[model samples]
Target: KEVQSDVCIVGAGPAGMLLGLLLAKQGLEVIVLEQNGDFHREYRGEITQPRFVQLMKQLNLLDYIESNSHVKIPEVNVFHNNVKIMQLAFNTLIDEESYCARLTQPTLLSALLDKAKKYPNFKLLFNTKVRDLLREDGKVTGVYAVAKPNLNIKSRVTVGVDGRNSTMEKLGNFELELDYYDNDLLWFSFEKPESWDYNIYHFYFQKNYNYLFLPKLGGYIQCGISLTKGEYQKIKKEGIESFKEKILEDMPILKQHFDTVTDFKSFVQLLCRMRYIKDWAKEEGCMLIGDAAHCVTPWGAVGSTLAMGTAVIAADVIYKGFKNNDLSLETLKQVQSRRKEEVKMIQNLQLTIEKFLTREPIKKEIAPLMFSIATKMPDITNLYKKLFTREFPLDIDESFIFH
Candidate 1:
């Protein structure tokens, strides 16, 4: 026997969970699946842009989310070769006393899940891996997920929220557009040094390493270092001493705290590639969301916010589709049509900015000079404004929120 619902959402990450909650409030039977049994995630997009603050507030859960443990970053200080160069204070950029909050992925997902469970029609099934797509008349109908007992799901709409390696998109046979960026970021976290200001972001640019430092909630600072593709192997091949020396040379402040990195096993490499599905949905039955649809680089810290942006728009689209009794291609296709422009621009901007980070070829030569001269350009600040702010708020109905 197959289980049924109004919507079957795959991958219970931020986007899927947020969408699930929204649709469930409208009395739709929403089932969200996660391949993992728990919410632990090695997070990217941990520290968010000001746009995230706006989205949470619009959902009317900003206060609820803030009650939990998180750090709010109000400023970013850019340093070139240990010389402080430029800065961005989010409050100055946006009207609100806005700041990027560093909340763990589990914390964000859990908060959304807590709200979702309040509705009887909502369910999240963990340890459920979607192995195939269920189709009807050449259109995706739902999915076949296997875990313990192996079950089938049927729904009017199926959404892919699984990241990078999207099972749903593959099963649906969707065509994709891949844009591979040049750099990869290796990330690790250490104890926040005493003199370090935990409220601001620390960005360093040196000959050897270009690093970004984010204050973690639990008395720690997460650091990400930029490297070219196939670079990690060389770093590893040279040995841990070489890694520590170079990182210390880039930013001497990390010496005492970074000493704990005995082995390269501590670092996690994240590729800077961006991807997009040309068609977000296959006519009526299936749709893609979040990282599953478009995976952008971690620059500008826009990936998660962009995904969540789609999540809200998706709720609006799906809710209207059910209201019109037409969850067909036209309804499903609008999800991308509405989002395509902003998403593309953000992805392109990430690529544009990535060009200036410390890298091989001409980039390394350009990075320091660009940082020093960045303040002179009126155009750079405009790009920052666009990157830092989402001009319009999400148009989600108050009725769709579970009060």
Candidate 2:
């Protein structure tokens, strides 16, 4: 009965932090345990999506995330070999929703933690770990957590909003399946042009790479390079100038922007396709949220956006379960089943896009068509909202007849 709260969330990243904030807002006592004490500056997932932007506003954390973020993407532009063919205005795509911000992964996580701190019911325990889950009568009742020597805590619901590489899921003996693929994604930030407004600029050279330039606050831009894992190293070893040249060689339009690029970061190649678990829940009342439950590669920059979407959805379910006093396995199953299709669609899209970028010869003919769809596909962004919010059922086969 010590250090007990309504919910115990492992990890203090965006998913955990956001979920904690939502729970605390509903007046549920939350104890959040983060393995690391500080947010990381070097990691993955920086681009915000329209759905997440709306979620941020709901939590009143939009100003902090945007003010501290580097880019504010208002419109997304798609191109092919210097031809500007497709454009999407963000406001029109998601019901007057603004484009998402492009912030460093760590800074965004920090903003969520800050918001969680403001709630009296939220108690964040940094530099801590969740050792194991407590179970009785074939159901999870709480967790056995350690923050320091001789200090252990327990809770009613032990949720792993941790991440893709979760310790809880691993240690708890939950089954996981890893999917490996063939691409590398490099993400970095650069000083933005003083005159530049925050817009999302994306160039596609099918079967080669897609370059995304996102403008953030204080005139900084976060750049993400998506290419084959093998070729990325060749250029990275050559240096930034050489990398920029390669980009221009594949797609000439990027040459002009190189002059303004600065503060480059390293590349991250995903070795595996993805980590998906057959069962995300256990007898001791443990559950997985965000990447712990599913993951999307950065090919389409959907990872963090989807994670944020999952966090809000999870929060809503947890709130409802607690209110109804029915935080049972059946309730958890209901939540997972409701959201599973969205998770599958987003991750599948990531892999589909990755296949094209990691292959060879830059398939020029199909390249233009893909770029056209990428640029003009504001409807795709709408599809994302419907997936996350469950607004309109994604009955694609039935809906195609109307178009």
Candidate 3:
């Protein structure tokens, strides 16, 4: 028997799940398929972007999230070796009250999953893998998959929320449209300094790599090292003990946390990759959201947040189309028209940041200089607020100032 719905979501990640929540609440039958069995493992995302904070508040998820989660980021510090180059007081950005609280990735996923579970119209298929798209004469109509593989199910208006290497995208012939050069590697859940009140640290080396230290729900820290190719391999082969010593040598302030070094886990450093589809939605009833439509560079820290934002917006568009008795190509076109510019801008900014932070020494000077200029320019910062926050209709009337 084939399970059906008004909307079928591929990938139960942040975007798919959140989109399901919104559409289901509006009485749309939504089915979400997740390849994962459970959301138990802790991942990164220790730092929540400000836009996510604002969206959470708008949705009234703030109270519950704050109560259930822990605060890990109070300030953002950017340094070079052991010297402080620039510090962005996240507290001074808008208001101390508007700043984001750090959260364990699992906690946020679980919170959204739990909320979505309460909606009867939402059906979540855990351990379900979508094998391929079921197309009809060049238009996407549904997907073919199994919650238990042997048992197949089909859906309508299928949406791909899968991460970077999206299967849906591979089948859809979407072009990978961005320049990427392998630069930095990432390690997380590393040792954090207990004495520091600010929970997040971003250390930018001299055109080498950026080291990010993020505090989590507990006193634990999440660290990501963005290093040039071959640098991380040498460190990995040498082991964490040597790595710890290297870190201490680079930043002697971490001498006390040497014992916690072995607890860290590092992943291969790679260049950032992004995909852009010439067409996001097909007439056959397929759509793309999150990374599928707009792949953000790791520098932006908006992967999940932007996914959620897009999910909510797409859900609204879907809901509105349903209310208007139209789920036609025109309706989907309107959806894309509204979101395209925002996606393009973020991709541009992502490239700019990636280039600035990963460039060789001379180019490296541009980042902090730009940051210093940006920090001083209230107008530029305010423009950033509207862009990063995805504030439409221009909300610049509110008093704006650079922190």
Candidate 4:
């Protein structure tokens, strides 16, 4: 089988789907390919910060996103020895609508895909994986993929939103600058406690451990615990019971449902990195967005938001390219010019967090105190509010549909 479109996007995750939706809404023929049969991945982050909320409203998706399964998170709280040290509210940064939101990734993607379906120009191919890029005389023109049998797709422009471990970047031979962190994450979820305050994000710090809990829809709480980098085997050998015991000791609040997390297999291990490609696009009519271009650590909770934000930027540039009937490397380079600095800033922020959170005993003790003091100052807290909401300075071309 063969497919054709004005633009061909690899990977139908948030970035790809949002870009597809924006372009399709403008009456361009867009084809999005996904290897998975459905939106339900094993695990996904649910934090949607303030800038994401603003973008949703611009797309007229706020109503559906809010009405769907979601929880509003207004503040972030830091605690040490069960003593609350700080609370930073989202409302301090922007208007009443400025707050972090938590909803299942599948729920958000499902809605975006459904809305895109309403446009006759949008086509989504699930259960189809792209294997290689198709090039013509040293220029990328499309992709070679597989569904049930073999499939070849041709397009005027190819965009890669495939993710951190992007197949498109790998196959396209894009050069990446990578950085390593000292810790990895293991994620699990349990029923929400009746006494818990659902609106605040809790970060409990202990000398030997760090526990993070985010409230999700349907009375559930997502838990993330950091471990030494590549140390899952050491923990597994000690038995899952020991792991649960340590969590109970750190966060006694989960005493009621802690026993439910009995099996190590139930938890998902996540490896993270900070990386970005120097050249986001080539003269071959190829470009990369989201994780395909840069990967962020989970500590800062900016991965998904960055993905969607960059997707919007990519869509706008491509839209202009089509308008002028020119899809050249120079035009596509705008994606990198518009996004590189912000991405570097975000990665540095995550690195700062990792440095503080994963520091020595004395530093760990001071981390909360520092955060507490920052919350007391309006200027510092407002700066934090911008970081939390991803309100970094960016040149917005208002003519874009979702700008």
* Most accurate candidate by TM-score: 1
Q: Lowest summed lDDT over 10 consecutive residues: which window, candidate 3?
A: 394-403
Q: What is every candidate's alpha-carbon RMSD to the true fold?
A: 1.8, 6.6, 5.2, 2.5
Q: For model 1, what is the alpha-carbon lDDT of residue 261?
A: 67
Pairs of colliding residues, candidate 3: 139-284, 140-284, 184-226, 184-227, 185-227, 185-269, 189-222
All candidates in order of lDDT, best leading: 1, 4, 3, 2
**lDDT at position 223, candidate 4:** 83
Across residues 1-403, which tens digit of lDDT does each residue of candidate 1 receive?
Answer: 5798889998888888988888898998999988887897445456778998888877777898898778888788888777888888888777875788788778888888998798899998888888988888977778898875378999988888988877777677788886576888888888887877886687777888888888776777888888888888988899999888887887788888776768878888888888988888765587888998999887778878889899899999888889889887878888888999899888888776777875767768787787678666877768877888888787666776545
Kindly indicate the candidate among 2 and 3 with the higher TM-score.
3
lDDT for 283 (candidate 1): 53
Can you give the lDDT of residue 189 in candidate 2? 57
Q: Return the lDDT, model 1, position 2.
A: 78
Task: Write the residue-wise lDDT of candidate 3 on 1-403 in tens digits.
Answer: 4666778788877887878877787777888887877776324355677777777766667777787756645455666555676655554556424565677677777887887788788888888888877777766767778665344455556788888778888776665555455566565554556566545646555333456666655666656666665566676677777766666666565576565456444443345666577778755576777877777777646777877777776876776777788777777765567777777877777766665554466666576566655556656656556434545322221111111
Residue 49, model 3: Cα distance from true site in angstroms: 1.2
Per-prediction TM-score, please?
A: 0.95, 0.77, 0.84, 0.91
Per-residue CA lDDT of model 4 for 1-403, tens digit only, reads 8877789999888898988888898789999988877887546667877778877766556887788877788788888778888777778776647778887789899888887788898999888889988898888889998895298999999999987777888777788776566778788778877778776588887655788888766677878887778678988899988877877788887787765666777788888777888788865689988887888888646788888889888887888888899888889999989888778878877777777665564676787677666568756755676466655433445554332
